[PDB]
Amino acid sequence: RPNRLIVDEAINEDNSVVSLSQPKMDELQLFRGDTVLLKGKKRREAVCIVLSDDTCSDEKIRMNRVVRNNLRVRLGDVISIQPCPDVKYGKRIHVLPIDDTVEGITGNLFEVYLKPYFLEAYRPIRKGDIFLVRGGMRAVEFKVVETDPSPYCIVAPDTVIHCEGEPIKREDEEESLNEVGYDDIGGCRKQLAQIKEMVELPLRHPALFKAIGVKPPRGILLYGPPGTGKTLIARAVANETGAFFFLINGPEIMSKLAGESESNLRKAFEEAEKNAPAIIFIDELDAIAPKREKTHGEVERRIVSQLLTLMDGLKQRAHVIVMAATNRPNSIDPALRRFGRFDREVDIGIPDATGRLEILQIHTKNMKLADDVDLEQVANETHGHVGADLAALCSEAALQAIRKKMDLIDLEDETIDAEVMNSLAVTMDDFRWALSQSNPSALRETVVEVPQVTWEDIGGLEDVKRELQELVQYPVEHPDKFLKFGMTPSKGVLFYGPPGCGKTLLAKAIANECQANFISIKGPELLTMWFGESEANVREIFDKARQAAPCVLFFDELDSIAKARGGNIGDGGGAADRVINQILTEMDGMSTKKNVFIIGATNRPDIIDPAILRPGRLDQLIYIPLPDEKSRVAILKANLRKSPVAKDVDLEFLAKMTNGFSGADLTEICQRACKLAIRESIESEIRRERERQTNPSAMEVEEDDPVPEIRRDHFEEAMRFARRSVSDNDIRKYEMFAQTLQQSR
Amino acid sequence: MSDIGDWFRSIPAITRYWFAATVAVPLVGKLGLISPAYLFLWPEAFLYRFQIWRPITATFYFPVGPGTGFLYLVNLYFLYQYSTRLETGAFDGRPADYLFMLLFNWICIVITGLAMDMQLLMIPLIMSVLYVWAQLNRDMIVSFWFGTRFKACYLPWVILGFNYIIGGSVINELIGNLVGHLYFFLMFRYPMDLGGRNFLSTPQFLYRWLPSRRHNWGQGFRLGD
Amino acid sequence: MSDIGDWFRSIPAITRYWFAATVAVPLVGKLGLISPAYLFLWPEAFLYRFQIWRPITATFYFPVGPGTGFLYLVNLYFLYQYSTRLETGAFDGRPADYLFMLLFNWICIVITGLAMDMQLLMIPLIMSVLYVWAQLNRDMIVSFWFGTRFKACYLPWVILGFNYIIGGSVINELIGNLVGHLYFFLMFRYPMDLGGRNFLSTPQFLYRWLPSRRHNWGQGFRLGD
Numbered sequence A: 001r002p003n004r005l006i007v008d009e010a011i012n013e014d015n016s017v018v019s020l021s022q023p024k025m026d027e028l029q030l031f032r033g034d035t036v037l038l039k040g041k042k043r044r045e046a047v048c049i050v051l052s053d054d055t056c057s058d059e060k061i062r063m064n065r066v067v068r069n070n071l072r073v074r075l076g077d078v079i080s081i082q083p084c085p086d087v088k089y090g091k092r093i094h095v096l097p098i099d100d101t102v103e104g105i106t107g108n109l110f111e112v113y114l115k116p117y118f119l120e121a122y123r124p125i126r127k128g129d130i131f132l133v134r135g136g137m138r139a140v141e142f143k144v145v146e147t148d149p150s151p152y153c154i155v156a157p158d159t160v161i162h163c164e165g166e167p168i169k170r171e172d173e174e175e176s177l178n179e180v181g182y183d184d185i186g187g188c189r190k191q192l193a194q195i196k197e198m199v200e201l202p203l204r205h206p207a208l209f210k211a212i213g214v215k216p217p218r219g220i221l222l223y224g225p226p227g228t229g230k231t232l233i234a235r236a237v238a239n240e241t242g243a244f245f246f247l248i249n250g251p252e253i254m255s256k257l258a259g260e261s262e263s264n265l266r267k268a269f270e271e272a273e274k275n276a277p278a279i280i281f282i283d284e285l286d287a288i289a290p291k292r293e294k295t296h297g298e299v300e301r302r303i304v305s306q307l308l309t310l311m312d313g314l315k316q317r318a319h320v321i322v323m324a325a326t327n328r329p330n331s332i333d334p335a336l337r338r339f340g341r342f343d344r345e346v347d348i349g350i351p352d353a354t355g356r357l358e359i360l361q362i363h364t365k366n367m368k369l370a371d372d373v374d375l376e377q378v379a380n381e382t383h384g385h386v387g388a389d390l391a392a393l394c395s396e397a398a399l400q401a402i403r404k405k406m407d408l409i410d411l412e413d414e415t416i417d418a419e420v421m422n423s424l425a426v427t428m429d430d431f432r433w434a435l436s437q438s439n440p441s442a443l444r445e446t447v448v449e450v451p452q453v454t455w456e457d458i459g460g461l462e463d464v465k466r467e468l469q470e471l472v473q474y475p476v477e478h479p480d481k482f483l484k485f486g487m488t489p490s491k492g493v494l495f496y497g498p499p500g501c502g503k504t505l506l507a508k509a510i511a512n513e514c515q516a517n518f519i520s521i522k523g524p525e526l527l528t529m530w531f532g533e534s535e536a537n538v539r540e541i542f543d544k545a546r547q548a549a550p551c552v553l554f555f556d557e558l559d560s561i562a563k564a565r566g567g568n569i570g571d572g573g574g575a576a577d578r579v580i581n582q583i584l585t586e587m588d589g590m591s592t593k594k595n596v597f598i599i600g601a602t603n604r605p606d607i608i609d610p611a612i613l614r615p616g617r618l619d620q621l622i623y624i625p626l627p628d629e630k631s632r633v634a635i636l637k638a639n640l641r642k643s644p645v646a647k648d649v650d651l652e653f654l655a656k657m658t659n660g661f662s663g664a665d666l667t668e669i670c671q672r673a674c675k676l677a678i679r680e681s682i683e684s685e686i687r688r689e690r691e692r693q694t695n696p697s698a699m700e701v702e703e704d705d706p707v708p709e710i711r712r713d714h715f716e717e718a719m720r721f722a723r724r725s726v727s728d729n730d731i732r733k734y735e736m737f738a739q740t741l742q743q744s745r
Numbered sequence B, C: 001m002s003d004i005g006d007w008f009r010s011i012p013a014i015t016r017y018w019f020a021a022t023v024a025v026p027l028v029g030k031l032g033l034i035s036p037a038y039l040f041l042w043p044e045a046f047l048y049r050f051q052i053w054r055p056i057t058a059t060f061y062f063p064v065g066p067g068t069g070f071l072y073l074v075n076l077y078f079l080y081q082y083s084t085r086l087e088t089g090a091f092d093g094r095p096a097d098y099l100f101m102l103l104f105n106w107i108c109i110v111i112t113g114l115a116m117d118m119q120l121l122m123i124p125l126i127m128s129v130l131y132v133w134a135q136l137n138r139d140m141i142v143s144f145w146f147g148t149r150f151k152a153c154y155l156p157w158v159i160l161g162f163n164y165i166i167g168g169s170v171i172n173e174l175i176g177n178l179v180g181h182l183y184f185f186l187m188f189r190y191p192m193d194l195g196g197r198n199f200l201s202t203p204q205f206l207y208r209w210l211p212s213r214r215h216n217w218g219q220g221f222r223l224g225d
């Protein structure tokens, strides 16, 4: 039977498209756009339109949420298809809204929702179908009650749409096309994939695990900053697989009186036991099971021990999976981590720029944002926000945009009109205004993400580029050639040279090329855990680096400890040596299975402790020389990307005349020239505006604002006020140390 | 805006007429225009004399007094509460079936009341329609303000105990239970137990008088472009 | 599902049968099948003529009516909730002893009723068996749903206070609360104190058809050869 397939989520959001594989469509003699009849479980049928796809396999069929709900199936099921290309054009269709969706709308729904939806699509429908339409600020579901001819018809420009009558009652077969699901999560693809796999295995076919005889997981621990969407992940999994999600709240349990708390918890577990394969979610685990030293009373110990006993009391029976959410995975009692209890940990990190863009795309789906906003800019300027903050931002922007329309809906009625909703649009000004008075909550959090700097941003330095490519890319991209034949890859590279030559840029560039996470630990924080704080921080720094492998750990200004050590204090040298002991101790503890790369940068190479300079640690040395050749011209292009022009001030002459300068100096020159251009443009605008105050609109020839047109004079004036930061002594010291490194050893 | 007006108007037609009659008859009966003796369904009078005066009024005239007002009001409330729910329950269309059920129950109850020596033909009919509604709407849990989660198919027995301990004349409630059970067996249980043809069938005369409501379309619009 | 069926079947056969008779006989009398005039336990008629109907019919038929069914319901609930407790308490292994106690109580109550001038010999038996249950189940707290608790072995006094204010027939229950104490003395108090008079001996002609509970053993089959 080359008919049955497997259902999976689709990437196109239309309600009448299912994606096959080209070989399967070719075998079934079906062409693009041909109508099909899809039949699923419970003897429910629906009609749909097929299309082409890129990477879908032969046995997989892609469809969105509406079609899956209509067929009354779930993910991972099977369907039987049938090509039925004899659809007859319809004549009259009766469609009615559902009761619990149109509360306070009134108006005429046909002219607002149905007409744009049913135009130039020829959407096939079938009697009893349910479809969802996005409107002003809500999503309204419409149910087809009857058609002609029955039961298949195609909407055509000549039809008799009846949309009159009372709304119909929601039935008890379809759960809802409005609750959470896999299409309501963004920026967490990898972790969602892991959880989906690990929970789809037991919750679908328990008998397979019974017959095989392996041990399914009995506990999953999710940890991350608050407001990143953990409860939502658990709810989505439970509502998609099919279960009896039963939330338990930590403060609710602790708020009881003495002996009834553990009794309530016991009824919770026994109920979830005898209600079929279910998921138990414990929110705010640290609120009820903190570290032993934190507790001072006695009821806390009793509650913790009761939880542990009930956890150990689960042995097979119904496959009940326990999930728990905690803020930071060290306040939990260490007793709750042995095998047979919470053992598998999944991290839910703060989203990056793409994650924020996707969250904004998800949350503003109902709105009717005007064709002037740019979500990319708002996405990439809001670093430091979490999902909840972005949702609040969208809500506030909508509220602000609707505030300045009270005149149109003055009093009106308790049921707001319909066309006023379609009269509302949200512009960039509203989003910026909501941005202004908004405070994020991440801030002081380590950021892990793939840097966007590419190879062209760096000018010159070919040999260093090749050496980094050899040392980093080869051991990972072809691990077979390294497991065969016994080569031990290096664990670290140390950068040294004149200051401001682009060490951070090289590190970020190789991190981007390798497509690996990047973690930067800068000098100020390093000295912050040096004095005042303790050295326990390095432990979780290395742990976080290990968690997100592969990664490129970066230690900047490694010589700060020695620079502060040598002076007239002589009290904290112990702290510096503790920093070095921590770095060395967790540096040697790394294993070769994981790919963690350590890179250090410094500008006083002769002052670093010789303990680090040793096989098994940071051992290769790379010397980045002072810039030369028309690679500084490429540098100038790198920061002149966005800057408009240069006309006739030949940059090659500047490169010829500016020998012995680092990158920071050239970037300073470019910024100074741009500042002069801004000053000139602003003074010209002010001259024009104070001139227009005398002659009213006396402008025969129309000139717009002066287009950014940087001349040579600005650049020459900026160049006059320029010097060289690095003296001639430092380069000679560096070359002396290089020669000593070459000869002495 | 008379709430009583549209409240009455929204009632289904046959329930509307029945409620109007069962409220209107007692008022005139207590006014004194017609003596109670004219309306009791006297068995020997009906058998010997044709007495076309009392084939119908036995279910409309009720001697309300300060000894049975609570029973009267609670029965009227039960009628109002469950007759409409049965009307909207699986009986939204084809009212002829409901009317035939009512008329058959009326004929059989009148015949058996002639067989016994009973007078007031209201309680058995109301309780029997409640019983058949509960039986067709079984397995669902519903109760009163203090009744937590009482299950269905038990209310008839509860009201039996109530009106037996508080009141009397349990014979007519018993015969209401039997007539409801036999009608359920004949209309529903028999055609699926043995597959026999429907012994009871609605004649086309009632369909002529009471056509079943079909799907209505109203007026719509052309999609155009 | 037949919840009522399993609820009835869970009751022991003797208790179930007796409860069913005591709840069905009054309904039969009320339905008019038999005139109640023959069911009053006439003292003079029973003394003159044997009239075998009366000694058995006076223990079951209750002319329940408005204003008097509360006592019927409360004693029925007490019967149902306290008969099985004593049945499985200490006489589960010897149901013949329980039946013999019931027979002795019936004989005493009918003898006194013929001697005295009461007609309904049901409530005294119920309150006497409640008294003997309380005496055999002393030292606990009395359930009281809408309030606090109480102390055991005071159940007969509570019943005496309850049935005195509501209705009457205080003499009947006063007489009834003597046979239980007499049996407690003879069967229980006498043997440990004197043990001389051993007239209380259950015969065997009922042992033949009333064996003990035993290991039950279910049923078996003969393997044969």
Ligand SMILES: Nc1ncnc2c1ncn2[C@@H]1O[C@H](COP(=O)(O)OP(=O)(O)O)[C@@H](O)[C@H]1O
Binding pocket: A184, A185, A186, A187, A225, A226, A227, A228, A229, A230, A231, A232, A283, A325, A359, A386, A387, A388, A391
């Ligand atoms: N893709 C997403 N990632 C993170 N948060 C989201 C996402 N989509 C929506 N949210 C918002 O995040 C909130 C999740 O609740 P949250 O406070 O994270 O639970 P918890 O208190 O367990 O952390 C929801 O209110 C939801 O509006």
Ligand SMILES: Nc1ncnc2c1ncn2[C@@H]1O[C@H](COP(=O)(O)OP(=O)(O)O)[C@@H](O)[C@H]1O
Binding pocket: A457, A458, A459, A460, A461, A498, A499, A500, A501, A502, A503, A504, A505, A627, A635, A638, A639, A662, A663, A664, A667
């Ligand atoms: N190929 C290059 N050579 C030198 N400098 C460059 C090059 N490409 C970019 N730059 C500039 O050098 C700066 C990098 O400085 P950075 O490396 O952060 O200072 P430090 O070397 O003290 O860490 C960037 O602002 C960038 O504009």
